[PDB]
Design a protein around this ligand. Structure first.
Ligand SMILES: [Mg+2]
Ligand SMILES: [Mg+2]
Ligand SMILES: [Mg+2]
Ligand SMILES: [Mg+2]
Ligand SMILES: [Mg+2]
Ligand SMILES: [Mg+2]
Ligand SMILES: [Mg+2]
Ligand SMILES: [Mg+2]
Ligand SMILES: [Mg+2]
Ligand SMILES: [Mg+2]
Ligand SMILES: [Mg+2]
Ligand SMILES: [Mg+2]
Ligand SMILES: [Mg+2]
Ligand SMILES: [Mg+2]
Ligand SMILES: [Mg+2]
Ligand SMILES: [Mg+2]
Ligand SMILES: [Mg+2]
Ligand SMILES: [Mg+2]
Ligand SMILES: [Mg+2]
Ligand SMILES: [Mg+2]
Ligand SMILES: [Mg+2]
Ligand SMILES: [Mg+2]
Ligand SMILES: [Mg+2]
Ligand SMILES: [Mg+2]
Ligand SMILES: [Mg+2]
Ligand SMILES: [Mg+2]
Lengths: 117, 94, 136, 76, 58
RNA sequence: UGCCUGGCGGCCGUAGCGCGGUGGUCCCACCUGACCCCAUGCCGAACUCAGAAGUGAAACGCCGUAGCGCCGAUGGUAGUGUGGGGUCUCCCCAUGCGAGAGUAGGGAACUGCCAGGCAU
RNA sequence: CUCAACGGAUAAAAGGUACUCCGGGGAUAACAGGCUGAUACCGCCCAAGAGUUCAUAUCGACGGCGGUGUUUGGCACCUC
RNA sequence: CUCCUAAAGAGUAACGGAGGAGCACGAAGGUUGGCUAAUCCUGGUCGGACAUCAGGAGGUUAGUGCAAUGGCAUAAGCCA
RNA sequence: CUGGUUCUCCCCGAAAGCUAUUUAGGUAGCGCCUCGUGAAUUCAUCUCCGGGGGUAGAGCACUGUUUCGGCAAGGGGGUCACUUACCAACCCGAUGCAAACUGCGAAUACCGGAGAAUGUUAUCACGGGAGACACACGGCGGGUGCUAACGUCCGUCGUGAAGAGGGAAACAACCCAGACCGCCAGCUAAGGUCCCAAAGUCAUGGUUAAGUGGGAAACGAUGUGGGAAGGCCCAGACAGCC
């Protein structure tokens, strides 16, 4: 029983609900070394904005690329990248991860940066 | 060596096939290879005598249709449910 | 007398007996008794025809019974009016369609198998015929 | 022992077939389980009655990895 | 355009309800009645439905 | 532009399973540590955090392979609407529709968005 | 409110009649007819076996196919 | 009330074929978070065909307060 | 509840179902009839398009059931831990069966949309007046019964009911066909054409010898017609005779 397939099972219900609501969701993927963030169109097939720690434009200004304060950088970056693009209200898709620690630090940072969710 | 004379069918379907069997004939089909399948008619009692021999289902038979020989092998046979008759034969190109 | 050891239900609808049969060729032995008629085969008729064939070949070779009486038949007793529920199960039958192979035999010469099948056919209510195993 | 009992028929089944134009709130299908599943603009009642949440034409589709039948409203 | 003539050859007594409706759709009123109709696949479909009791004259 | 990886989809087995091979710069996975955030109806297994010594064993991805699954004609057969007929518990004829199973065969998915790496 | 006779005649109700009576019904029974033929009766088919030997002189199991309308019935079509 | 009869929309009778109900629950309801069976095999104190433990197979053959049917993995099943 | 209900013509024209009922031969609402008024291209048929099926059929992965083979746990009876009249799970291969089985799945029917043609609005709504709620047979699909009944109970269509005429000898329900009236005209349908009795003692090619036709099964048989093969045979077959 891989931890991944058990995690997609945890994320399926919320994603179906967001798909039914027709909302533009902020997807978050978390690895032991990196953290990722995507804003998907309501149709679920277009990536509007994206930000992560594998981008050197953000990675160079971090001590370690996979700790809690690194997630706050991606949260701040993905929000201001989306605000100027025109998206203001989204829905946070924790995607099977517990809303705690790094993904929580990513969320409130994006919430602090002016993304309404 | 078995050689069979056949004619190409003009029309298919339940109504046509039953008229054949009333006229002492029965339909058949030739498929296999890259060519298109070929629907043919066969004289029943003449073919019925040949299939009574065990080598009919093992050797390679030749069917002359429009004066053209085709080497095939008997693939499947549809017999009458309770009469000593044939209803259909599948021929696969050798 | 053949009979299901147990059933999901005790009584069944009368139904109909249309169509042709499945299992129209000798599959186990070399000779078979194929039914050309339509009707029912009670469990007693099946047993009677089996004994006639079993004794005909003096208990030699192998005999298969390709049918099985799985349909229960109910009857109302005498001096009973219509209604008051379905009758009680009295015997079991197997529905037979034309072409059904009833018995198969192996291990005996053909001339002996014909006489064995002829003796058994006299016990059955449907017209039958002799068939032999063929190369499919 | 004795039979002779039955219950009243419940009039289940599809009420609006594919392509039919419906108003918001129209019942599409009554069912015991979710033989049909709610798609877009279609709600699922407490008895799994599928009703239109918007006007438009009803649409039957089979989707998902389990090949389940969905009913949606093409809003028009 | 291309018209055809249809004649009713048998009676409508005892026919199916939709067969009587097809004769009424063609305008045939009695045995031997002949009408003129436009040769259309919709008309051809009506004739085919009651072909056992009508005769078409093309 | 090509190769490769990750994320989100379309599609829902021609897409699955097995068998064989193969991949670690990056990515991913395992991994290291755990006082603390947090966690175990016991357990840092899981969840979570802090990390980067090691390893591609597992897992995952990729490549091959017809062992199985899966897909699948043509023809025939069963059934059947309408009309007619018979020896009428069942059939037949005209006409329209026409399976299921099986056979030949197919088949080791396809594809969109974004991102990163690498070659270019 | 087991008003459960569950759209619930009253808050409150069991029987006998061969001493019977009225209005009706062949819408519905008993006799007889009819239809039917499970049953009954009669015949036939197969032939295990009995008959010292020998199936078929005489019987005939296990089963099968009919006839009659003839018993017990089924139905309720005629006559209340 | 559930299934069949019921003739692939609905409905559809018989003293037709089978079963149930006249409740239960302040959690067995709401929500958030998590979780995934049956059976069997192997190994293992008492310990046995069957207890708890570990692993593999298996893939819902389990489960659902109760009949049947339709559902149920995003679980409608299990835990906080 | 039974009986009876008195002049004429014209138009339309049922029902014997559902639901409820101390209700079942009564009655009520609805369905069906009539009259009036109003209203939409409203309705019907066909073609095309969009649908949902789970029936017929089929199938056997599932639920059950069933036969054979293989592999074999195990149950066996046998010896006292050996080999042993027998039964045998699971699995594998092969073969069937199912109203209450489905990994399949029609024809039809039904719902919706569009389009012509045709139909005296044939459709819906409201209002006045009803009748009817004992149905019958025939076809098809079934339950029940004995795939018994001119039986019984549903579905659906037709006819009778409430429909005359022609045919089936006679024969409500079958076949043909829907009678406004008159004609000493014609053409046809089912069914018929030797006589009763209107029309072919018609034509061509066959079959039957049983008055079969003009009532019936298992089964029996050198009846006879047609067809396709086969064995044997002038190295003399088959029958007869030595
Ligand atoms: Mg046909
Ligand atoms: Mg870890
Ligand atoms: Mg197919
Ligand atoms: Mg009452
Ligand atoms: Mg009542
Ligand atoms: Mg009352
Ligand atoms: Mg009196
Ligand atoms: Mg009477
Ligand atoms: Mg009497
Ligand atoms: Mg009388
Ligand atoms: Mg009397
Ligand atoms: Mg239905
Ligand atoms: Mg009138
Ligand atoms: Mg009125
Ligand atoms: Mg069937
Ligand atoms: Mg099965
Ligand atoms: Mg009444
Ligand atoms: Mg009545
Ligand atoms: Mg009736
Ligand atoms: Mg009657
Ligand atoms: Mg007369
Ligand atoms: Mg008139
Ligand atoms: Mg004339
Ligand atoms: Mg004359
Ligand atoms: Mg002459
Ligand atoms: Mg005679």
């Amino acid at each position: 029983m891989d931890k991944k397939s058990a995690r997609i099972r945890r994320a399926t219900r919320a994603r179906r609900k967001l798909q039914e609501l027709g909302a533009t969701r902020l997807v978050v993927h978390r690895t032991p070394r990196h953290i990722y963030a995507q804003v998907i169109a309501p149709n679920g097939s277009e990536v509007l904005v994206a930000a992560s720690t594998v981008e050197k434009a953000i990675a160079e200004q971090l001590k370690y690329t996979g700790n809690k304060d690194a997630a706050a950088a991606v949260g701040k970056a993905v929000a201001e990248r989306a605000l100027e693009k025109g998206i203001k209200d989204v829905s946070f898709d924790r995607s099977g991860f517990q809303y705690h620690g790094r993904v929580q630090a990513l969320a409130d940072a994006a919430r602090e940066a002016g993304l309404q969710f | 060596m078995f050689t069979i004379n056949a004619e190409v069918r003009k029309e298919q379907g339940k109504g046509a096939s039953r008229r054949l069997r009333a006229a002492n004939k029965f339909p058949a089909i030739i498929y296999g290879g890259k060519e298109a399948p070929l629907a043919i008619e066969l004289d029943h009692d003449k073919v019925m005598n040949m299939q009574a021999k065990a080598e009919f289902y093992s050797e390679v038979l030749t069917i002359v249709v429009d004066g053209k020989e085709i080497k095939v092998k008997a693939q499947d046979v549809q017999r009458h449910p309770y009469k000593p008759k044939l209803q259909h034969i599948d021929f696969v190109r050798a | 007398m053949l009979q299901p050891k147990r059933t999901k239900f005790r009584k069944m609808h009368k139904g109909r007996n249309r169509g042709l049969a499945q299992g129209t060729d000798v599959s186990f032995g070399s000779f078979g008794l194929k039914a050309v008629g339509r009707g029912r085969l009670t469990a007693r008729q099946i047993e009677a025809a089996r004994r006639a064939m079993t004794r005909a070949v003096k208990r030699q070779g192998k005999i298969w019974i390709r049918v099985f009486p799985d349909k229960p038949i109910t009857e109302k007793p005498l001096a009973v009016r219509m209604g008051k529920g379905k009758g009680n199960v009295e015997y079991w039958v197997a529905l037979i369609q034309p072409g059904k192979v009833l018995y198969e035999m192996d291990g005996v010469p053909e001339e002996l198998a014909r006489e064995a099948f002829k003796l058994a056919a006299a016990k059955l209510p449907i017209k039958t015929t002799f068939v032999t195993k063929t190369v499919m | 022992t004795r039979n002779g009992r039955d219950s009243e028929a419940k009039r289940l089944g599809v009420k609006r077939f594919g392509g039919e134009s419906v108003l918001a709130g129209s019942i599409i299908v009554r069912q015991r389980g979710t033989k049909f599943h709610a798609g877009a603009n279609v709600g699922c009642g407490r008895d799994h009655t599928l009703f239109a949440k918007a006007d438009g034409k009803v649409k039957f589709e089979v989707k998902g990895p389990k090949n389940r039948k969905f009913i949606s409203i093409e809003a028009e | 355009a291309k018209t055809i003539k249809i004649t009713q050859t048998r009676s409508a007594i005892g026919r199916l309800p939709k067969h009587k409706a097809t004769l009424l759709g063609l305008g045939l009123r009695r045995i031997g009645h002949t009408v003129e109709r436009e040769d259309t696949p919709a008309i051809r479909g009506m004739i085919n439905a009651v072909s056992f009791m009508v005769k078409v004259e093309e």
